[PDB]
Ligand binder design. Sequence first.
Ligand SMILES: [Ca+2]
Ligand SMILES: [Ca+2]
Ligand SMILES: [Ca+2]
Ligand SMILES: [Ca+2]
Lengths: 144, 19
Amino acid sequence: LTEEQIAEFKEAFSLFDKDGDGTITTKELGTVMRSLGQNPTEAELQDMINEVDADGNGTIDFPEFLTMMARKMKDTDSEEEIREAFRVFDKDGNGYISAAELRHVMTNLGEKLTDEEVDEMIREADIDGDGQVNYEEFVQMMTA
Amino acid sequence: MDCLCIVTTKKYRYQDEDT
Ligand SMILES: [Ca+2]
Ligand SMILES: [Ca+2]
Ligand SMILES: [Ca+2]
Ligand SMILES: [Ca+2]
């Protein structure tokens, strides 16, 4: 464990869980997703858990919070996973994000980023140089 | 879905410039 990331996992969880049990369930996960404009059903939510859960309990707990913590950091350049994040980084569904739905995403997910903060992130993934982020750019940034 | 997107968000943020 890195001191720099000594309690990051806790930081995120601190904003997800609510019932003080410290495990994000189906209904808990749903709200976070719903706040971004997405409104799916139980099958869509439970399917997500199965995406992380590997103990057969059907709920993301602590081990999965360490295992998938690495998995995703290695399985970043896969295929649809690049579209996945792009899907959670967009709301209007147009193909690109800027000082638009980005701010809304962070405020409803769990990341501090003021205008000048996201501005950095703009020139961070603005390969094409139009002051924006899109599929074509994110794919390259998501690995390089 | 939020747990993995969070990690990806961190990987997209933590590059060199911004933290
Ligand atoms: Ca809970
Ligand atoms: Ca589990
Ligand atoms: Ca958009
Ligand atoms: Ca761009």
